Design brief:
part of a larger assembly, 7 chains, A mainly beta (about 120), B alpha+beta (about 130), C mainly alpha (about 55), D mainly beta (about 80), E mainly alpha (about 140), F mainly alpha (about 160), G alpha+beta (about 100), B: about 130 residues, alpha+beta, 3-stranded antiparallel sheet, about 20% strand, globular, E: about 140 residues, mainly alpha, flat, RNA-binding, ribosomal protein (chain B), Ribosomal_uS8_CS (chain B), structural constituent of ribosome (chain B)
Amino acid sequence: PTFNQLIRHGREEKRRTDRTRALDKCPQKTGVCLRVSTRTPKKPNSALRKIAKVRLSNRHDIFAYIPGEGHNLQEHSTVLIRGGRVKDLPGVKFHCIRGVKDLMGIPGRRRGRSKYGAEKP
Amino acid sequence: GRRILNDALRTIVNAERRGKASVELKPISTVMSSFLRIMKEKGYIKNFQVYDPHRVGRITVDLQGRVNDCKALTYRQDVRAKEIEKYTERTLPTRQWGYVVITTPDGILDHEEAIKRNVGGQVLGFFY
Amino acid sequence: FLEPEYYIGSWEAPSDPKDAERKLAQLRRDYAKKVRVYRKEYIHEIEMLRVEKQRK
Amino acid sequence: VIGTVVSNKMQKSVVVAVDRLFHNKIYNRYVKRTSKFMAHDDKDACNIGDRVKLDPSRPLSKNKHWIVAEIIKKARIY
Amino acid sequence: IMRQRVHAILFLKEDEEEEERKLGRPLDDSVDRLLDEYPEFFISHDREFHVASLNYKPDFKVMPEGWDGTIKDMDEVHYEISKKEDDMLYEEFVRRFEFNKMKWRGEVMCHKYSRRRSSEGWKITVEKLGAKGKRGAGGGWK
Amino acid sequence: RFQTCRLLSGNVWNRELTIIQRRILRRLRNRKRSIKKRKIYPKKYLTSYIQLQTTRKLPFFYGDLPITEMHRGTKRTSYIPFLLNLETRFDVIPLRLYFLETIPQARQLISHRRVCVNKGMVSITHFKLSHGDIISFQENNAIIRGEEIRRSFYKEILVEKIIG
Amino acid sequence: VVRIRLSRFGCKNRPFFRVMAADSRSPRDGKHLEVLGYFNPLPGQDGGKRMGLKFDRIKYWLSVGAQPSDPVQRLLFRSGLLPPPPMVAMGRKGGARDT
RNA sequence: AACAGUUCGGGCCAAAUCCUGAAGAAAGCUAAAAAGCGCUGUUUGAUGAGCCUGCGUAGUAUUAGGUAGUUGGUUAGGUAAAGGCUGACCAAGCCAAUGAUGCUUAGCUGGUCUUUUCGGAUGAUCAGCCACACUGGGACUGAGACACGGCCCGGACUCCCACGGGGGGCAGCAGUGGGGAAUCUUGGACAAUGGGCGAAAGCCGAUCCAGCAAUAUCGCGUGAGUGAAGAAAGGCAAUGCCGCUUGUAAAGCUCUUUCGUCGAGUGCGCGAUCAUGACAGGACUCGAGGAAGAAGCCCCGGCUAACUCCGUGCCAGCAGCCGCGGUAAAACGGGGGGGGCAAGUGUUCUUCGGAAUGACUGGGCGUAAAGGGCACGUAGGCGGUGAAUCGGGUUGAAAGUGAAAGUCGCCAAAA
């Protein structure tokens, strides 16, 4: 508005909410997997997707997807959690990094081996 | 800066781009007379005959037809002599031209006369 | 450019068995009085400069 | 330095008000802000509404480290 | 030619003669013997600073109606700045080539002796200096 | 490498073009370089296509340093680090401009061998030198590269041109 | 006691001292009154030697009474303004060179 | 820096420059009675401290009243120094819509990242300052503390004890256990700079070096050159043109051996200083001397440089966004091939830009979000002329200061 109004008022910024709510700004927070549930993606995409409900070390419990085909995860498997959100399945905003801690990366992948925790075949 | 000043300048500009050639402004002033003259001998107008030196108020300005946007400032601000080299970069054609008009204790200047005499004052107007 | 140039010898400290008091006397009186003299000079000359500035 | 009195009932501790400019270049306006001073004044003599000059001094109270001076423009009171 | 070019011509032919003496009457001049003018462009400068100015910032300055003055020429004001650059160029290259010549016989490696201290600096009026020498005081000189 | 010429759709100065390389360059150069560069008028960012082609030509010219990175080091666009590295990078620029192959032939030379400047060895491989700098080989460099520069200035400027 | 002294001022393994009028109980690099020029302790190539000092104010601070430390006398005599160090007694014997 | 003096008792088992009285203020010592030191006072100067103060210095009104030493005044103390610092008594003020009081976040500054600029994010390393020292509470000495390895008190917590009591404080350096996503060696040396006492010889994990970390930087290297038998294999193909290509690539072969590896040899310079080397199995120069010791990741549906074969069939799965998968998937997976970067790459987190997407520079509010139902009026902003005066703002000039490091220009050394 007028400068006088601007001098006596804040001209405050625009507010948006960052979706990620890991307890801290830390890149990954480790956690233990409570239950492993396969869920169906929102339409049009149609399939079964493997996700694990994980309680982070901060004690907040967040659903985390496992990327790649094949999971050795069982109840209480400790898996480092990164922040990655899949669009098709709503409510899952976290990813599990393969090849670290407990979840074991897929050895077979030969392209993109760095992700999926694969040593060189 | 006043608002009768802004008024005189905008009436000039609007009469110009409307296409008339001779206009009259009722509420007159010394800082406005000085400014009409400054525009004149810098080229932008043709005659600026003020009528009543005191107590009444009337100017008749007859105009050429040059560009003349010339907004007349309202909110005062200082101008030193060595700050114009950067401040007159915030006119319309930042580089080439327009004369930021400055007021001094030694008479109302433009920015050329100012940076020559090394005097300061306060900004009043623009030129484009 | 209006600066001098000359030479100094302050050697021959150890001469006789176990009597360093030679160079010790050197140190004490020589060096102290040296520096003190220099300092006096400085005081007077700099206050000279000051009074020049006042006359200015 | 200059200022105007606002309150008086203090028994040698007359309090005046003085303003200045909190000019913030950023938004480029001359704005006004005040800071209400207090000044010792013997011979207690002032009326709310009449300006005064001041001058600094060593501490004189928990506040009130000013000193009054001449009464500029003493104003009438109905 | 360019002045410093000429200078290096002097130096190079000179020490080449000095090593002619050394290596005896065998003198190479093999590739130099080429004086057919197809395999070469070798564009050499006689003037300097003719490709483009130091800048061409579009900026102006208006003179009033009764200017009662005479304008200047642009090709003419050019080459004045070229002459400034040219003089500075000669000075700087002279100094650098000079020190390189005086450097043809010096020490830049891991060995020195380092007992002089080069008394210097006033930091308000420093146009005078001096040195020290080795364990002798010296001074006032240089 | 010739593969890079094939990519650049032209001739990046591979040496000793064997016979099928002759064939493939004639094919590629004429057919492809024509058809693309001749009459297309694509929206295919011809400006940016050109940009890729030039920023890919230049690095081989100066060996293998990334020149987009040179651009980026300063906040300018170009022409300044150009005039600069060409004022000297001291092996790739001058040694080739006079007598060598700018490639790791003229490189690694400053790494192990010597070319003393003002009789001073400067073995950094990226020096900038201007305004009064004497460039000199060593003698055990001379006793071979005098003959090498002769066989260059003649076998590669007289002989090859004349058989051409 | 203003101790006109020399504080380190440079990269590791190749330092560069600097002359500043300090206070005694101030840190080595601490709050200085003012630097007084410099003293590069490295041997050079133009004149393969060392350089550095300033004048015209060390007079004033000596006059007002600074007691400095002898690693500064090693310069404030080598450039005058002082007497030599009263510990210039002797010299190691047997320096040998062959280059 | 200068000026004046350092006399006597006495007490401390023994005596002191220890204490304590007198005068004047103290105190005398000598390197076999020796000068030269000291100590006290007068007078200055410097450094520094203490105190006080103008101005600038978070958000929050879904926190509107707060405060009785409160606000002033006198009087005594007070303090080294003014003062509600204070007791007493006196008078009732003071702060608040310029947001007081509350409530939440936090050490501040030079500055680091980004941005042309403004701004915004940060205050870690390095320095200015304040605060803080297991938790609370005090105070003593002393120029100089309420003092981190000074004292006393309480608490809380540990550790030994003979059992009574003692003892304990890493938020100094390195080092353990804890929590984490994770942040170093229980190194060396005063060798130098810097501080301390010593007239002088002499003592320090500050510091200077060293140590592990692709933690970032900048580099420099993993070769030069041939090299068609287009090798074999590798793919793809109607399976044209060496079918295409890997591929001059390899292989071979001749140079080259820096960085690094091995062995020699020191006032070179870091103490070049009288001398003082930890660094230092460093460099320095010389030599054995083989390409031999050194190439990886990401991407190839479009955005966006780059593509093909097979597997795969709404399953598996990728997606930063738009979306691909229902037997021809260039998007999933495998084989080959190629682009981008390169000792580094890729993902996530983190902050700015793009983002004019809080618009001062740099917006809008008729139909798109947004003109209050309307006015009144408080501050508040802003708002006629000509004449005069003053000189607060304004503006011209000088000095002081605006720590140094930083940004930046130049210059030079440095790689």
